[PDB]
Structures are given as structure tokens and as C-alpha cells.
Amino acid sequence: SHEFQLATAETWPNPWPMYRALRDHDPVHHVVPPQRPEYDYYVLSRHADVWSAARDHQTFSSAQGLTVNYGELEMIGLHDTPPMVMQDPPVHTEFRKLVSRGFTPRQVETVEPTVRKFVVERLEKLRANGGGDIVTELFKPLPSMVVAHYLGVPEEDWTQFDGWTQAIVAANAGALDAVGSMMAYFTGLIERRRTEPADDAISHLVAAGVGADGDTAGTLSILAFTFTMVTGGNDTVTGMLGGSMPLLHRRPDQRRLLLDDPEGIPDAVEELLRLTSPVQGLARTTTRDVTIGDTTIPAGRRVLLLYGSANRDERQYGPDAAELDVTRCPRNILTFSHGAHHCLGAAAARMQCRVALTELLARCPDFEVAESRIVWSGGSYVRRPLSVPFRV
Numbered sequence: 001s002h003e004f005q006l007a008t009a010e011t012w013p014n015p016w017p018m019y020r021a022l023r024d025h026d027p028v029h030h031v032v033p034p035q036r037p038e039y040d041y042y043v044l045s046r047h048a049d050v051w052s053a054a055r056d057h058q059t060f061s062s063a064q065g066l067t068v069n070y071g072e073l074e075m076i077g078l079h080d081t082p083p084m085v086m087q088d089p090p091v092h093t094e095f096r097k098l099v100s101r102g103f104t105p106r107q108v109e110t111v112e113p114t115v116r117k118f119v120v121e122r123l124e125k126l127r128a129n130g131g132g133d134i135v136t137e138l139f140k141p142l143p144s145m146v147v148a149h150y151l152g153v154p155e156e157d158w159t160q161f162d163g164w165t166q167a168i169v170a171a172n173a174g175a176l177d178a179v180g181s182m183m184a185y186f187t188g189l190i191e192r193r194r195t196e197p198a199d200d201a202i203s204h205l206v207a208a209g210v211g212a213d214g215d216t217a218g219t220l221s222i223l224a225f226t227f228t229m230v231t232g233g234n235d236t237v238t239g240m241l242g243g244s245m246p247l248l249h250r251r252p253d254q255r256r257l258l259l260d261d262p263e264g265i266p267d268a269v270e271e272l273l274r275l276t277s278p279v280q281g282l283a284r285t286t287t288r289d290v291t292i293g294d295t296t297i298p299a300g301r302r303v304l305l306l307y308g309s310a311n312r313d314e315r316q317y318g319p320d321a322a323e324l325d326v327t328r329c330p331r332n333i334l335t336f337s338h339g340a341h342h343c344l345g346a347a348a349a350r351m352q353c354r355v356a357l358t359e360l361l362a363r364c365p366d367f368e369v370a371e372s373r374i375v376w377s378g379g380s381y382v383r384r385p386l387s388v389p390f391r392v
């Protein structure tokens, strides 16, 4: 089908034609759900519309939620202390300013050798067994360690922390024990950082004074951030890493460029981020009428920003937008959104892609994946594999 529909595990394999049908024939697409026409919403598939909408937080608010489901915030219980990705400026501004102190070049640099060691270990394990599931053995567990790092979790607690993480990530595709452990654990770690600060985002929040004094809205705000980190920082990286496998497999010319010139790997990472776009879409809510071409979207409606389509928009990337070109150097990709909410983890995600790719090519250059045997996670916003069978 080319008909608009929110993705399911069955449709994640190949949503691209439907994006194209939208972009060509109905770029400001009105969804009127037959069973609930009142919950109509709009859909944006073109690069230019998505780029400007992502930037224009005044018109396209994050404050009501990020899906197409009206009533989201209230329904899940997030009004009083929403995550930063559901705050607009000016409120979003000060918090973002404080937490950003934990997202610097030094934080991505200090974890990189840890990332490489783990990749090496799991790739050698796969190699030795002649293959296995590269998601289960590597692409799933890997991102948790990086999130743990950015949260200042002591390494000795990472295995416990990853267990909680995996339960939460699957549920958010449900996780009561894992939620409770994390909230118990971080409440304790937050208290600890009052007297033993580190360079991480939590330490920075606490050092800058958030949560002081059994109070606590501040504390819930740091806990909400921990959940933002866990729910946004894992499945996305796994979609990047796992989604890259079929793309590289089918293009031995493109692997050649990188095998002959590994310094093209940074650039190769951007192209992979472009085509995988693990956050394929997120919504905004119009705060006033807004006209894009011939469609006026009414104030108060949800708008789905198809980052995944914008990244494949032929108007921005040319008629071959659909194909891997590791030398593209794409401009203005939408993988990490654009504007106030631009992914704080962008450098961390890029690093994990760079290390994994470098070591895949160094250690498992003759590898096979069967696209038809990839199993995609459910859920309509992030596109990531649950399993990628891998033979070496």
C-alpha cells in the first residue's frame, strides 16, 4: 500500500513508497481516522515543510505531546512535570541550558574506548560462532552503556541498569518493576551527587541546584530526564546500527569506498543516519492557523513531522535520494530534528555508529544479512529491528 498509515512491524520494512506518494501528491496530508474523525490530524512529508516546522516551536508546539493521539499528556499522567522533549521555550530553555553541560566533547571522548572494547568483544564472539543475531548480541545492549555514562551511573551498576533499561524500552514499544528500580536507584544517585559531583548531566542539574530540599519537583524533573534518556537513547541507536546492516550489505561498492578509505567513515555515518532516520516521525500541535501551500492547518491540530520522509525528499536530496551514497555529505538532515529540541545525544549516537562501523569493516568484512529475515519492532515513531540475523 501507498495509502497513509501509521507504521507497524509489518510495514517498517518498506515505508518509503508511501512517503513518496505523500510528498508528491499530498504533502500537507489530512488524516481523518474513519473510526474517529474528531481526531483528525495532519502529516508533513516534505523536507522544507518539516525543517521549518521543527524550527518554529512557537507555531508547532511540543507541549501537548509528540504523537498523533490527542489527550496524550493527560492520559499518561505527564501534565505537572513533563519531560524536556514536551516543554516549549522559555520553560524548556533553562533546563536544557543546565543539562547541556553534561553533553560536551569530553563526555563523548571518555566513553569511546569503553564502546570500542564491547563492540570488539561481541563481534569476535559472533565471528567465532560464525554469526548470530547482531541486534541481540551487540546493537541492543551497546547503547545502554552510553546512556549509563551520560547519567553518571558507576560502571559497576551497568548490568543492573541495562536490565531495567531493556524492560522499559520493550514496554514503551508494562515495566513496573524496572520503573520502580530506576526511580529508587536514581533518587539515591541524585542525593549522592549533592556531595560527590561528577561531570555528567545529573551532577550538573544537582550542582546547579535542581531538586534541593526534599523538593522535589526538581527531583521529579531529574527523574523525568533519566527516563527521557532511557526511552530515547537506546532503541534509536539500535535502529541506526541494525538498519545500517541491510544498507551496507546490498552495496558492496559503498563498503569498498570505506574499506579503501576508512576516513570516509564519519561521512558514511551521516548518510546512514539519513537513510535509517530511526526517529521516523514525531508530532507537534499547532498554536495558531498555519498555511503551507494550499492547505491551512487549523490551530489546535496535531501535525506529524515525518523526519524519515524529509530525509528521503528528492527535492532536497535529488532523484537518487533513496540510495546509499557514503560520499553524499547530506545537508541539513532531520535525524536529530532541528531547532530547540535538537538531539543532545547526536555526538554520542554518531560515535557509536562510527565505532561499530569501523570494527564491522575491520573484523567482519565478509558478512551476510537477509533483509527478509529482519524482524522490526512495533511502534509507529521509531523504526528499529528486534533481530537482524548475521552470518560471518
Ligand code: HEM
Residues within 6 Å of the ligand: 062, 066, 084, 085, 086, 096, 146, 147, 150, 228, 229, 232, 233, 234, 236, 237, 240, 277, 278, 279, 282, 335, 336, 337, 338, 340, 341, 342, 343, 344, 345, 346, 348, 349
Ligand atoms: C540515532 C540515535 C538517536 C536519534 C535518531 C535521536 C533523535 C532525537 C530527536 C529526533 C529528538 C527531538 C525529539 C523531537 O523532535 O521532538 C531528540 C532529543 C533528545 N535526545 Fe536523541 N536521538 C538519538 C540518540 C540519543 C542519545 C544516545 C542520547 C543520550 C546520550 C539522546 C538524548 C536526547 C535528549 C536528552 C533529547 C531532548 C532534547 C530536547 O528536548 O531539548 N539521544 N533525539
Ligand SMILES: Nc1ccc(Sc2ccc(N3C(=O)c4ccc(N)cc4C3=O)cc2)cc1
Residues within 6 Å of the ligand: 066, 083, 084, 085, 223, 224, 225, 227, 228, 229, 231, 232, 233, 236, 279, 282, 343, 345
Ligand atoms: N533521543 C530521543 C529521541 C526521541 C525522543 S521523543 C520522546 C518523547 C517522550 C519521551 N518520554 C516519554 O514517553 C516518557 C515517559 C515517562 C517519563 N517519565 C519520561 C519520558 C520521556 O522523555 C521520550 C522521548 C526523545 C529522545
